Structure 1
Amino acid sequence: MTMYIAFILSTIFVIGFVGFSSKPSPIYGGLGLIVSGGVGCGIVLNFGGSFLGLMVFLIYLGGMLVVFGYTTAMATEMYPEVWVSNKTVFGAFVSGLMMEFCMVYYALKEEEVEIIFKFNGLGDWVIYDTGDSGFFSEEAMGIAALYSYGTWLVIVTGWSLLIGVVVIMEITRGN
């Protein structure tokens, strides 16, 4: 049902998170990350972070795009791996999908839980708050404050990208 739709969207985020963390062929992991990234956009989009969801979507597609180019450039093998072919990644795959299965069952069955922290499974819909935003979106207006309140953050971030191009040329210079 759509009532625990966020419960679902959270899950396939981690099944995709598991799939690429099982270290399959590099581009296959790229697919495993993007499905998680795509559904990961859904979770934060559900909570109201429309801009945050779109940006984590947009640039991570750009981030994963450049990853694929390098994988087939100098990081691919003449006999590529698959999630099933190698038993090691197969073992990593199967371990991941039962790890969530046994746990989300336990969390949903008892709804109190103990592991690391205490978790009331109940429903993520509960903690939404009776608030009105007026004629402005908080998720977008707060980010807009970066250029009026976060001048130091802009300076440190902007500076860092500049060396980011310096290092990306410094270490690739090849003598």
Structure 2
Amino acid sequence: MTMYIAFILSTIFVIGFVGFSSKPSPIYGGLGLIVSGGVGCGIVLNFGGSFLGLMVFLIYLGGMLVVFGYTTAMATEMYPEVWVSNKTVFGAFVSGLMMEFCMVYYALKEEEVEIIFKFNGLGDWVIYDTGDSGFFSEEAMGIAALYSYGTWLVIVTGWSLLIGVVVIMEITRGN
């Protein structure tokens, strides 16, 4: 109930997801994914995850820049489609919006199990921590533990990245 900020941000997250999942044109799909990344960063920030939200926003900004370049190169047409320029795209968009609104009404006015379990609402503030200690950020400590506890993870991740470079070069070699 308290300012509904998390609920509003998650609803905008779902709206951006519906925006790019109706697939109007990769330009507008990239715009919707950027909007979703921003609101997801906000959602994670509201839970105390500053570093993770900022990181995911930066990564998806770079990814969508590359996707924009590739859309200009290889995924264009004479008339790019928007959400109101085509009946299939508009129908999918409106169906997604109505599905989100119906699910919200179902879970808010009632307390029923959609798929997994039930939910009454009350705002996400209830399940917080009231933990009072620390001269450090716990998320920062957990993420920094990658270089002392996660040696195996670092090894596999670095090997995967090097292999990915080799792999993309092999795939695009052609001939």
Q: Report if the CA contact (8 A) 2:18-2:93 is conserved.
A: yes
Q: Report if the CA contact (8 A) 1:6-1:124 is conserved.
A: yes
Could you report, residue by residue, the CA deviation over 1:7-47 in whole angstroms, capped at 9, with x for unpaired residues? 11010000001010001101110001111110011101100
Q: Report if the CA contact (8 A) 1:113-1:120 is conserved.
A: no
Q: What's the offset of the Cα at 1:88?
A: 0.5
* Uncovered stretches (5+) of structure 2, i.e. residues with no partner: none
**CA distance in structure 1 between the partners assigned to 2:155 and 2:69 by the alignment:** 31
**CA distance in structure 2 between the partners assigned to 1:138 and 1:111 by the alignment:** 34
Q: Which residue is 1:72 aligned to?
A: 72
Q: What's the offset of the Cα at 1:105?
A: 1.1
Q: Report if the CA contact (8 A) 1:112-1:119 is conserved.
A: yes
Q: What's the offset of the Cα at 1:114?
A: 4.3
**CA distance in structure 1 between the partners assigned to 2:157 and 2:16 by the alignment:** 30
Q: What's the offset of the Cα at 1:115?
A: 3.1
Moved over 4 A (4+): none
CA-based RMSD: 1.3
Percent sequence identity over aligned pairs: 100
TM-score by length of structure 2 reads 0.96
- Give the stretch that moved more between structures: 100-109 or 111-120: 111-120
Q: Report if the CA contact (8 A) 2:106-2:112 is conserved.
A: no
Q: Report if the CA contact (8 A) 1:111-1:122 is conserved.
A: no
The number of residue pairs the alignment matches comes to: 175
Could you report, residue by residue, the CA deviation over 1:68-111 in whole angstroms, capped at 9, with x for unpaired residues? 10001111111111111011001101101111111101111114
Q: Report if the CA contact (8 A) 1:27-1:71 is conserved.
A: yes
**CA distance in structure 1 between the partners assigned to 2:87 and 2:6 by the alignment:** 33
**CA distance in structure 1 between the partners assigned to 2:59 and 2:148 by the alignment:** 24
When residues 59 and 133 of structure 1 are mapped into structure 2, their CA distance, relative to the original with a 3 A threshold, is farther
- Give the stretch that moved more between structures: 125-134 or 33-42: 125-134
Q: Report if the CA contact (8 A) 1:21-1:29 is conserved.
A: yes
* Uncovered stretches (5+) of structure 1, i.e. residues with no partner: none
Q: What's the offset of the Cα at 1:112?
A: 4.5
When residues 53 and 107 of structure 1 are mapped into structure 2, their CA distance, relative to the original with a 3 A threshold, is same
Q: Which residue is 2:34 aligned to?
A: 34
TM-score by length of structure 1 reads 0.96
Q: Secondary structure at the match of 1:142?
A: helix
